[PDB]
Amino acid sequence: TVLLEVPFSARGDRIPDAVAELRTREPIRKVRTITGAEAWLVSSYALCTQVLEDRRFSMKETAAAGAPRLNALTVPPEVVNNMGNIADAGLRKAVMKAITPKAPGLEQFLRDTANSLLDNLITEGAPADLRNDFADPLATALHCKVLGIPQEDGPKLFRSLSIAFMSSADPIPAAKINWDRDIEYMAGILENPNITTGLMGELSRLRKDPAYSHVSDELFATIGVTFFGAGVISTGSFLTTALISLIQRPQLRNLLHEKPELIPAGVEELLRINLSFADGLPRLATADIQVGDVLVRKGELVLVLLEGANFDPEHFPNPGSIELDRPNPTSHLAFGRGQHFCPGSALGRRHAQIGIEALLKKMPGVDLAVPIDQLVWRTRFQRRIPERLPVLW
């Protein structure tokens, strides 16, 4: 037989039995990626945390020419170091402040938008597609608001994402076409005097501030494209797969309906059990480093399997059960850990909380309209998502 291949499954509704077997028997072990490269797959909470907390396992270096690759780049190599470039330009604090959910009116915008989307679905009648006609539109509207760009530009930017977030063995010509076009769009936004709010409004002001005169226009536009893209794909995909986990747990669905103050704790458990990331997080070793029983060598690829950590019974007893009273509820790795911890974690939480709150109020009897095995799971993609999520209520 051939070396074990990753990823194991594109399904986002069940974790394969192989994960628990590897975690117990070989929590770091060699696998083969879709490009044909070898890598170390890390699947226990202890070893996943070790890797993510040691910067000698470098995100930036995964873009080096000739490196063993998880998948092909869909962005220019410099963009793998996006957060480092933002930090070096002195923009970290400004970006972080712009993507907080605490901006005035933003939560009321989210609620209003969620309720309008649901009203339209009710009006049209069942079955409804909760991904294409609820979760993803809600994500897109939120990120247009956060960025300060017109709501009507959301759909065209969104249509790049089914290619931009592909997990491909080879370079993708369409990724470059859409990237160059979306960069041109964000560059136009920086020169548009109508754009004065949100992240792009703030970047547009800083761009003309003498303290930032040598920050490149390329970086400013890239921040817009990457934060829209990562934010929308991440929140839309998480919300979609969380709704599946909720629908499949009618007791929890009813509890959260009856006691909405528990929704934050429920979203924390839905994050923990979420399978939205289709591959382990990649890092390239910049030194020889012992991880468990393996000496990883400089230049090797390591993959941090988030569901390995998050379903590890040694850290989360009864890991497959959603339990709202865990003593360590936020210690999951759904947002990563260490240098590259998700900068939009608070906003992703509020997106899901408000979306679920609205759905349970408007459609308390929501249920799948097809057998769960009929969901079609997107393949060769950086997220696990069903192509359609048909529900009735």
Ligand X SMILES: O=C1N[C@@H](Cc2ccc(O)c(Cl)c2)C(=O)N[C@H]1Cc1ccc(O)cc1
Residue 229's binding partner out of ligand HEM, ligand X, none, with CB under 5 to 8 Å set by partner kind: ligand X
Q: Are the beta carbons of 6 and 32 closer than 8 angstroms?
A: yes
User: What is the closest distance, in whole angstroms, from the C-beta atom of residue 170 to ligand X in the complex?
Assistant: 16
Q: Is 83 annotated as a binding residue?
A: yes
- Closer to ligand HEM by CB, 257 or 384: give it: 384
Binding to ligand HEM by residue 148, rule CB under 6 A? no
Instruction: Please tell me whether 74 is known to bind a ligand.
Output: yes
By beta-carbon proximity to ligand X, the closer residue of 99 and 230 is: 230
Binding test (CB under 6 A) with ligand X, winner from 79, 126, 187, 346 = 79
CA separation for the pair 77, 292 (Å, rounded)? 31
**8: helix, strand or coil:** coil
Find the helix or strand (DSSP H, E) in which 25 lies: helix 17-25
Whether the CB-CB separation of 71 and 164 falls below 8 Å is answered with no
Residue 242 touches which of ligand HEM, ligand X, none (Cβ within 5-8 Å per kind): none
Exposure on the CB side of residue 119, measured as CA atoms within 13 A:
6
Among 49, 226, 235, 310, binds ligand X (CB under 6 A): 226
Q: Does 223 contact ligand X by CB under 6 A?
A: no
> With CB cut-offs between 5 and 8 Å by kind, which of ligand HEM, ligand X, none does residue 164 bind?
ligand X
- Binding to ligand X in span 154-183, by CB under 6 A: 164
Give the chain's length.
Answer: 393
Q: List Cα–Cα distances, 118 to 129, 168, 279, in angstroms.
A: 11, 34, 32
The nearer residue to ligand X, 44 or 382, going by C-beta atoms, is 382
**266 interacts with ligand HEM by CB under 6 A:** no
Q: Is the peptide bond before 127 cis (omega within 30 degrees of 0)?
A: yes
Tell the smallest beta-carbon distance from residue 100 to ligand X (Å). 18
| Partner whose binding site includes residue 45, from ligand X, ligand HEM, none (CB under 5 to 8 Å by kind) | none
Dihedral of CA atoms 161, 167, 171, 174 in degrees, nearest 10, equals -20
3-33 burial, b for 16+ CB within 10 Å, e for fewer?
eeebbbbbebbebeeebbebbeebbbbebeb
In whole angstroms, how close is the CB of 277 to ligand HEM at the nearest point?
6
Q: Using CB under 6 A, which of 79, 83, 255, 324 touches ligand HEM?
A: 83
Residues 238-257, one symbol each (x = binds ligand HEM by CB under 6 A, - = not), give: x-------------------
The answer to whether 298 is annotated as binding is yes
Record the tokens describing residue 360, joined without a space.
């349970």
DSSP label at residue 186: H
14/10 Cα distance (integer angstroms): 10
The answer to whether residue 281 forms part of the interface with ligand HEM (CB under 6 A) is yes
382 is known to lie in a ligand binding site: yes
Q: State the binding string over 315-334 for ligand HEM (x if CB under 6 A, else -).
A: -------------------x
In the complex, residue closest to ligand HEM by CB: 344
Residue 49 in contact with residue 309, Cβ under 8 Å? Answer: yes
Strands 301-304 and 38-42, sheet pairing: parallel
231 binds, among ligand X, ligand HEM, none (CB under 5 to 8 A by kind): ligand HEM
Residue 235 interacting partner from ligand X, ligand HEM, none (CB closer than 5 to 8 Å by kind)? ligand HEM
Q: Which amino acid is present at 323?
A: E
- State yes or no: 151 annotated in a binding site: no
**Distance from the first to the final alpha carbon of the chain:** 48
Q: Are 235 and 114 in contact (CB under 8 A)?
A: no
Q: Is 382 in the site for ligand X (CB under 6 A)?
A: yes
Locate 374 and state its tokens.
Answer: 């009929």
Q: Give the interface with ligand HEM as residue ranges (CB under 6 A).
A: 59, 82-83, 99, 226-227, 230-231, 234-235, 238, 276, 281, 334-336, 340, 342-344, 347-348
Q: Which residues are annotated as a binding site for heme?
A: 283, 340, 342
